[PDB]
Design a protein around this ligand. Structure first.
Ligand SMILES: Nc1ncnc2c1ncn2[C@@H]1O[C@H](COP(=O)(O)OP(=O)(O)O)[C@@H](O)[C@H]1O
Ligand SMILES: Nc1ncnc2c1ncn2[C@@H]1O[C@H](COP(=O)(O)OP(=O)(O)O)[C@@H](O)[C@H]1O
Ligand code: ALF
Ligand code: ALF
Ligand SMILES: [Mg+2]
Ligand SMILES: [Mg+2]
Ligand SMILES: [Zn+2]
Lengths: 284, 304
């Protein structure tokens, strides 16, 4: 099973791609990267990257301002981002809205409504979700089942049909898949294993794991690599049947289309220290 | 404004302490560390560390099992942990309703509602109200920023929806409990929010936005822990030197921006920080500031 996401990046069937895992592991960095690789690789198709983390970071990552209305990434012809602000969205729908935009769960509700509107309206060929950390993303992926059972007039029936339709698409391995991102450390590895078990139980396809921030080894770096390697061995045993993609810690943060594009190549053809080592240092 | 949490750790008024920030910055590591520093220096008080992150890591961090019910940290007399379990709580509520209402009648409350987004914040909040109704200090190991903001808006949000309410008794009592929590969270002597961050663009700007949000909720925030620092000019690795250049850039901005805050600088250690011993070792630097010249050896002193 190839150690890269080339199969996903060139997929001709996938409509919904979730990128998830523990906090700070690189979900935003990776979902920007997957979205860039897909857009470059399939010029004919139109891609949306939507952040369902209420503390959005797509604008921070690209260095340009996104919002509830999809906008093209400057420099791309076929990649767009969206960051929904619930109180802004509600304030528009209402035309108390504002109080509602502050209720726990409103973020997931509006993100789901965005999915339904792409169902109803059928714009973008593929949607990539840069998700909130693990715990709240599981709640989001359960929404189709949840709404189904709760609902269980013509507009209520309309809501019902649409959620059943999402439930069916989300559980179709050709249409929907979840890419896990993790770091090779105890707290991340165990959280990721719990997440994968839960996803399998939801009948959601999960076939890929990005292991990010690897040192591939300064005494501090030598000790930290020794640790990463121990958990990396475990990841190899556990996830033998998965695409496991090993990504390096770079010499600086990864921001802007240029640097994100440069990092994203290694999701497509896997990082090789022999041939690619200099690249880590171009991010300073 | 001393670059440490000594005022907070030795405080005799604080009842509610929130530790929050962007994903993966070290909230759980720092909240365990703050709680241990407090428990150790206030032996006569009793502390509860509660994780409101639905993906809990307190058991992972100490390396032993916690749950819905508080349990002492092995090796501490003074500190307890709890990891709130939503489905479990709903299940017991449903069981007790049946055994002494459409959602309850068919015994499926947990099934129907255990997965509704927002349910974790709802139950975490119920948990808060219980310590109100009847541990001296509670430290919250919070979920990442976005959902924690929703949690912290909740008492103030409920107060206003309820205001428009205008078993009705339970709603009345909820309204009353909401008001006192709301009262206590805006009391700078009873509650404070400790921000945690790493010295990188995404974390810095998320933190800046978070703190501006908290201030508008009248929640006290006067502390920022800057975690995972390399301090590469102490001792002598190309990657570390370049990364330190990045970090130092953002640190200079943090020191300027948060001149009136306790900004507490913590080193990246040579391994993950797990178990009472390693957390305790790491935690001394919240109380007395880390000095890379003198304290540098500590990053290699973690037990396995
Ligand atoms: N492999 C990497 N090398 C260097 N910096 C990285 C790498 N992956 C992520 N980052 C940086 O790490 C921090 C966290 O990444 P982020 O994508 O925000 O994670 P998450 O979305 O899971 O919170 C950010 O500052 C990001 O720029
Ligand atoms: N200063 C540090 N040095 C080394 N490892 C650290 C440090 N702070 C946190 N960690 C490790 O970094 C990862 C994320 O920390 P964690 O406390 O889980 O963050 P958060 O709770 O904000 O998600 C964990 O593997 C933890 O052991
Ligand atoms: F990734 Al975390 F608390 F576990 F932000
Ligand atoms: F901290 Al994140 F996505 F921004 F987990
Ligand atoms: Mg993110
Ligand atoms: Mg945590
Ligand atoms: Zn190094």
């Amino acid at each position: 099973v190839e150690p890269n996401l080339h199969s996903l990046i060139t997929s001709t069937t996938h409509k919904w791609i979730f990128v998830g895992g523990k906090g700070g592991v690189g979900k935003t960095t990776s979902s920007c990267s997957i979205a860039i690789q897909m857009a470059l690789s399939q010029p004919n198709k139109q891609f949306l990257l939507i952040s369902t983390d209420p503390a959005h970071n797509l604008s921070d990552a690209f260095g340009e301002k996104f919002g509830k209305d999809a906008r093209k990434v400057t420099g791309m012809n076929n990649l767009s981002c969206m960051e929904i602000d619930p109180s802004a969205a509600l304030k528009d729908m209402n035309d108390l809205a504002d109080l509602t935009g502050s209720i726990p769960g409103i973020d997931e509700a509006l993100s789901f409504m965005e999915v339904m509107k792409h169902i109803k309206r059928q714009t973008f060929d593929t949607v990539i979700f840069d998700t909130a950390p693990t715990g709240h993303t599981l709640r989001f992926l359960q929404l189709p089942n949840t709404l189904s059972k709760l609902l269980e007039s013509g507009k209520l029936n309309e809501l019902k049909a649409n959620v059943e339709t999402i439930r069916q698409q989300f559980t179709d391995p050709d249409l929907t898949t979840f890419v896990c991102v993790c770091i090779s450390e105890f707290l991340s590895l165990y959280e990721t294993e719990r997440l994968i078990q839960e996803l399998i139980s939801y009948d959601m396809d999960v076939n890929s794991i990005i292991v990010n921030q690897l040192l591939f080894a300064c005494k501090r770096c030598q000790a930290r690599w020794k640790m990463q390697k121990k958990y990396l061995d475990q990841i190899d045993e556990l996830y033998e049947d998965f695409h496991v993609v090993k990504m390096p810690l770079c010499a600086g943060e990864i921001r802007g289309l240029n640097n994100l594009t440069k990092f994203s190549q290694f999701l497509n053809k896997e990082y090789n220290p022999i041939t690619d080592g200099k690249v880590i240092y171009e991010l300073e």
